[PDB]
Coordinates of N, CA and C in Angstrom, one line a residue:
X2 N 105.0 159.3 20.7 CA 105.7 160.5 21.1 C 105.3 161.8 20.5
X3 N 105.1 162.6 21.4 CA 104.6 163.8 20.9 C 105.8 164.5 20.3
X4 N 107.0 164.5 20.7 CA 107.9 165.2 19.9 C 108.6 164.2 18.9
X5 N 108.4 163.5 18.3 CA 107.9 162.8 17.6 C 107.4 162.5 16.3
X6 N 106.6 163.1 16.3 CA 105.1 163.8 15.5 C 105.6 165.1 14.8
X7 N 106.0 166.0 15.9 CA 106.5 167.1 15.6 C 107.5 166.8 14.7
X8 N 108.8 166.6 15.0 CA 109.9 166.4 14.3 C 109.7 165.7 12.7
X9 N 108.8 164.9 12.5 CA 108.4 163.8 11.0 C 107.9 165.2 10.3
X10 N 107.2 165.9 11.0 CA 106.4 167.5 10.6 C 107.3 167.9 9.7
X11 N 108.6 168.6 10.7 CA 109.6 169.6 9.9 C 110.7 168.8 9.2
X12 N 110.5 167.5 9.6 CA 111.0 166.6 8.1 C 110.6 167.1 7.0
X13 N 109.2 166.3 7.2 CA 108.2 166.5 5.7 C 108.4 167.8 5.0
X14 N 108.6 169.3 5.8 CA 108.7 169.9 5.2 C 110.1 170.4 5.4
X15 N 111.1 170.3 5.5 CA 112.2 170.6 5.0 C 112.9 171.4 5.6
X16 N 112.4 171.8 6.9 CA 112.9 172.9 7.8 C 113.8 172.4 9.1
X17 N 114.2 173.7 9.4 CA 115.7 173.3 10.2 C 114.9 173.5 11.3
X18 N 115.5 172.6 12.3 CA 114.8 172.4 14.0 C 116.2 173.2 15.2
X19 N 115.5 173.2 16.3 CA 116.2 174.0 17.5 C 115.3 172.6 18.9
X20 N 116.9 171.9 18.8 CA 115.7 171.2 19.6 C 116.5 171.2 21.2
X21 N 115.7 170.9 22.1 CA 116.0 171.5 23.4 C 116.4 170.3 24.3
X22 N 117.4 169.9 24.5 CA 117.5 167.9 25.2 C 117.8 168.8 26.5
X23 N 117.3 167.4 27.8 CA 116.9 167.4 28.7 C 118.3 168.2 29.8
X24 N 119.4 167.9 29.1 CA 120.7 168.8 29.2 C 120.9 170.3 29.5
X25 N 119.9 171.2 29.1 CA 119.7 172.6 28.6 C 120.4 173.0 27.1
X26 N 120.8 172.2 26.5 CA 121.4 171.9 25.1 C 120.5 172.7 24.1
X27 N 120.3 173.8 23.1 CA 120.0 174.2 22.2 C 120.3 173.6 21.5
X28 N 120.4 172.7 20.4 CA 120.4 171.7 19.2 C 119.8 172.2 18.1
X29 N 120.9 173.1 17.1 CA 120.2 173.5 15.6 C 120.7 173.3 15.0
X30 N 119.6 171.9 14.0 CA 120.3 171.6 13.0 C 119.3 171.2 12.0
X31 N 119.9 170.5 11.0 CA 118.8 169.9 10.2 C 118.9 168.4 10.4
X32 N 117.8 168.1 10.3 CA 117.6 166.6 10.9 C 117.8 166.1 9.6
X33 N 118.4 164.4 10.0 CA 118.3 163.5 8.8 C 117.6 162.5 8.7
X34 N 117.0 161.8 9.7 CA 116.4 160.5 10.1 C 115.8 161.1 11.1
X35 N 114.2 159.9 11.4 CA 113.7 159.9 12.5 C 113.3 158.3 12.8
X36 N 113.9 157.6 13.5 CA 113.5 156.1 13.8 C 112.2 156.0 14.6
X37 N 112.4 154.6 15.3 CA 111.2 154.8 16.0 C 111.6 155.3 17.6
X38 N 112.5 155.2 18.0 CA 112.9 156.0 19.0 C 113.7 157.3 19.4
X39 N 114.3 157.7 17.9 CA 115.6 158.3 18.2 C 115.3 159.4 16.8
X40 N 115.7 160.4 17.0 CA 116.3 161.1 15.7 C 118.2 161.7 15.7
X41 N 118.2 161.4 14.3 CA 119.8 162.0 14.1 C 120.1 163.0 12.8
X42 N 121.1 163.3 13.3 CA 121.7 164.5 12.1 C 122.8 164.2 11.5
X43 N 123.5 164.7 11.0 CA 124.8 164.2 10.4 C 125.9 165.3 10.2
X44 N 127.1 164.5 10.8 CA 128.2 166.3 10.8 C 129.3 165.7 10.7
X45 N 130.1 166.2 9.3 CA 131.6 165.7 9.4 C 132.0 164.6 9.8
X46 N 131.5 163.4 9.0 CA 131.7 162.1 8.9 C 131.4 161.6 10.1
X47 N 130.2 161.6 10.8 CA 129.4 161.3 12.2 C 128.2 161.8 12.3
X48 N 127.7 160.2 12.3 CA 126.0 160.5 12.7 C 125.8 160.8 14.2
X49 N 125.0 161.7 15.0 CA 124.7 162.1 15.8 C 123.1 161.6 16.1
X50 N 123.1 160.6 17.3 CA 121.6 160.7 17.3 C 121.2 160.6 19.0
X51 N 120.2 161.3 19.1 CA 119.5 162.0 20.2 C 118.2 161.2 20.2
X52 N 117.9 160.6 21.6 CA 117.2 160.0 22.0 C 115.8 160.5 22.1
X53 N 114.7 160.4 21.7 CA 113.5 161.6 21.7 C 113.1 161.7 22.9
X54 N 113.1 160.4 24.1 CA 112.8 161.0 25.1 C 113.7 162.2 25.8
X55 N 114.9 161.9 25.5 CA 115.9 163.1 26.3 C 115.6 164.3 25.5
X56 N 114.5 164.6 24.9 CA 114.3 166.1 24.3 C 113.0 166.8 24.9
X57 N 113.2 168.2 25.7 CA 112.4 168.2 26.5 C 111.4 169.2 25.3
X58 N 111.7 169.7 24.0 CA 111.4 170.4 23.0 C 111.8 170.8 21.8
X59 N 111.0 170.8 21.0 CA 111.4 171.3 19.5 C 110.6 172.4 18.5
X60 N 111.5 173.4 18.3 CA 110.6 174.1 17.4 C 111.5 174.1 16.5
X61 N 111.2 175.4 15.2 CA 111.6 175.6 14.4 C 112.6 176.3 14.1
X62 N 114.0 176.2 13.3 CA 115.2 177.3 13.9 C 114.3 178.6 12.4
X63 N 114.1 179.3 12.6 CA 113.1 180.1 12.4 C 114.1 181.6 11.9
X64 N 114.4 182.2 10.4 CA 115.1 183.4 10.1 C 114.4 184.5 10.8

């Protein structure tokens, strides 16, 4: 998965992502996991996790 790739990226470094699911959904958060299919985040006692193919993009949530 090419978004995928990407996402383990702004893991490694520690940055917050804007990621774009197939929905028209803006998604800015900071990731917590990236499995082999899925990445999730975590919010107020709930893990949230988004399927990487239903993400049509991801960049960086960028100051």
């Amino acid at each position: 998965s090419e978004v995928k790739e990407l996402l383990e990226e702004f893991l490694k470094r520690n940055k917050p992502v804007r990621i774009h699911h197939k929905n028209g959904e803006e998604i800015k958060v900071r990731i917590t996991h990236i499995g082999e299919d899925t990445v999730e985040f975590e919010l107020n006692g709930r893990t949230h996790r988004i399927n990487i193919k239903d993400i049509l993009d991801v960049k960086e949530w960028l100051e």
